[PDB]
Amino acid sequence: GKPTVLVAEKLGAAGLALLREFANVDCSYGLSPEDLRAKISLCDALIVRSGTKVGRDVFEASGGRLRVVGRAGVGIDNVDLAAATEHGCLVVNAPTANTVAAAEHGIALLTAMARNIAQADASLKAGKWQRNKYVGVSLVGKTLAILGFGKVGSEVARRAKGLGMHVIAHDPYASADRARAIGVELVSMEEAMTTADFISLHMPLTPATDKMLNDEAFAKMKKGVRIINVARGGVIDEEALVRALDSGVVAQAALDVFTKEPPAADNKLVLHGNVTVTPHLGASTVEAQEGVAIEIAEAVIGALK
Amino acid sequence: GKPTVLVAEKLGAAGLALLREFANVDCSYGLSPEDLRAKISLCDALIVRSGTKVGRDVFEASGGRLRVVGRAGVGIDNVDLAAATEHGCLVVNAPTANTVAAAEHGIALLTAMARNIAQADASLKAGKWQRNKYVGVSLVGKTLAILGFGKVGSEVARRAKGLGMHVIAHDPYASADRARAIGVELVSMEEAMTTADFISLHMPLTPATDKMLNDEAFAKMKKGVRIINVARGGVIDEEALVRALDSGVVAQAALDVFTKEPPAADNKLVLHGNVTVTPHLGASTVEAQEGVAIEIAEAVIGALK
């Protein structure tokens, strides 16, 4: 009746001040596998965002006590979730506030990839002024294709049919009901490769869809198609987007996630004209700061009853 | 039988093909006010986008014959209509194809400003990596006050409520039915200064509005308000936008249009962290390139009946 929780990484003071109301809080951020292993032993719950090595060894190390683990935010594959339920351990994540701030930061990438809000604000801050150089295109009647109709890339579609596009998605595991409701149509894979002016990636990087965007799939697309990637940057074979952009098969690209974050400074899509990159800012809104902080706080507490 | 039309400025290729169908077409782009005067004398129609030396002096030089003159684009005040009024001249503009893709490039300035898509893509192409500097804001439950419920600001409300915002607009001239129809509430002026998380300018620069936004104006606003000017930059007393972006009353500002274009290099709004400046790109989309070209072509062809 004074439970105890390890905060492994920095966390929103909205949240922490909840936990300090129903627990004891260890805010020892960033701990070597050792400090964790020695700490885990003595604490009923652990909370982590995509950065703490949680896996078999951390699980064994605790021996009872550790009843529930809270992952802060988007992904989950942080934790070896197999050992979780195995050593009888609960696993709760925080995905409502980080989906918003995600589907938001993609809309912001698509609209601003289309009008060159970057390279223009570049040349004008750089003393230049070439209106003929940075002439946008028009996300209205333009078919947008979405790969991975998850929670993110559906709250994207929700938004893009508000901008007025004809939006389609492709994911075998998406209920034709929830897609037809939000206003989307569910269509085949090559119907989404070909017939698209805008492409929005939302596929989990697995050995099943890795390097999917190679050079066999760039030819299928309509030439001049535009790509926005905000969910697992490995799914693109980056050295073919380096080449469909230079050649002209892909018109423009706007990438938030990468194969290796941070990509080396030579990295050819990071340094390029038709690209507009942000450094996994996907969920970086001050409202999903407080929002994920509070919602795990509320999750942990619930499962730690 | 064989009417005749002067094209003063470069005009879209589709429409020129339209004009050569029902006229002779002299595309004499960039005429000295003197050549204009001598030419106007012999032609039934003159067409001109934002930026041609038309006025009383040109009106008189033509002495009849010049029935109609078309402003290739949104603007209708490019010239002294008072003399066309006075000279039996007709006056036709392009009030639609440039309408859409201005509302568009408006939105895209709001969204790319919120998530710092410019200042971010910049420093990553600049070999930095600071996921913590370029932290956004979440345009969702947020109030967007649209100053001026023209055909521009309306169709920005259209998109903005689709990103899911609370949009109010204030222009004493828009029937509240045309407002409540698209889903927007009309309210007062100070209920737009004070309650706005986002302020979109769509005021034409009536003298009355020249330097409206001044330090009195900025003090009224909620601190943290973001200002997307995409209409006519004279309305902002730039020396004070600079001192609320600096002093932190204005959060960020996305500016497409300026007091004087192309501005002084050293212009503090042009060169500023919290400002995203594109250069009057408000129209530069190829669906309004061809779109305006063909609509005023259409517009003159009729007025020339």
Author numbering:
A (entry chain B), B (entry chain A): 83 to 387
Question: What is the paper's account of this structure, in its own sentences?
Answer:
Here, we cloned and functionally characterized the maize (Zea mays) gene Dek20, which encodes phosphoglycerate dehydrogenase1 (PGDH1), the rate-limiting enzyme in the phosphorylated pathway of serine biosynthesis (PPSB). The first step, catalyzed by 3-phosphoglycerate dehydrogenase (PGDH), oxidizes 3-PGA into 3-phosphohydroxypyruvate (3-PHP) and is the rate-limiting reaction. The mature transcript of Dek20 features an 1,881-bp coding sequence, which encodes a protein consisting of 626 amino acids that includes 3 domains: the substrate binding domain (SBD, residues 1-179), the nucleotide-binding domain (NBD, residues 180-367), and the regulatory domain (RBD, residues 388-626). DEK20 and its mammalian homologs are classified as type I PGDH, characterized by 3 major domains: the substrate binding domain, nucleotide-binding domain, and regulatory domains.
To elucidate the molecular mechanism underlying enzymic activity, we first purified the full-length DEK20 for crystallization. However, no crystal was obtained due to relatively flexible interactions between RBD and SBD. Consequently, we purified a truncated version (residues 1-387, referred to as DEK20WT), which includes only the SBD and the NBD. DEK20WT forms a homodimer, with each monomer composed of 1 NBD and 1 SBD. Both domains exhibit conserved architectures: the SBD contains 5 α helices and 5 β strands, while the NBD consists of 7 α helices surrounding a central β sheet. Indeed, both the superimposed cofactor (NAD+/NADH) and the substrate (3-PGA) from human 3-phosphoglycerate dehydrogenase fit well within our structure. The 3-PGA is situated in a cleft between NBD and SBD, stabilized by a series of positive residues such as arginine and histidine, while NAD+ occupies the binding pocket formed by the NBD. Interestingly, a conserved residue His at 284 among different species was located between NAD+ and Ser282. In the structure of DEK20WT, Ser282 formed a hydrogen bond with His284 (3.2 Å) keeping the imidazole group of histidine away from NAD + . Correspondingly, the decreased enzyme activity of DEK20(S282L) was also restored by the H284A mutation. These findings demonstrate that Ser282 is critical for enzyme activity, facilitating its interaction with His284 to keep His284 away from the cofactor, NAD+.
